[PDB]
Amino acid sequence: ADQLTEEQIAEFKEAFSLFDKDGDGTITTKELGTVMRSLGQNPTEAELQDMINEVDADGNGTIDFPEFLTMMARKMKDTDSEEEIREAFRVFDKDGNGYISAAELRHVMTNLGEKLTDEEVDEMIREADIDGDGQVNYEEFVQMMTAK
């Protein structure tokens, strides 16, 4: 719905150069931590990480121009396809970003009966991730156990 004038948003593109600092067109935890270190001196290592997770609304793990506008405009997320798995997902997601990072299972698996070690948390998702992108999406989640 609607559109955005790329010509007018060109002023915001300056954040993909000056804000970026390195000039690669992608805001990552490194450059962000650099800017926040000189013009901030408050956000910790874990802070800038969570902060970036507060920007990435698509879950691609990379700050892109399209989501830049979304972050600075409408912070709302829908949900209505994961019904049953949602009951499980809300507990499996923990942080609330859809994809499984690692820390989430470190809670549900440790509360599963045994204790989940951080060394096995990588091996487990590497078995879970059928695509091999490094993340656990709802797609592969249902297309693994429920889908025979």
Partner: peptide
């Protein structure tokens, strides 16, 4: 491998939701 643990919570959820 905790992989088998992946289906456990999900299976338990399915069972609980089916119950």
């Amino acid at each position: 491998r905790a992989a088998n643990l992946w289906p456990s919570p999900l299976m338990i959820k399915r069972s609980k939701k089916n119950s």
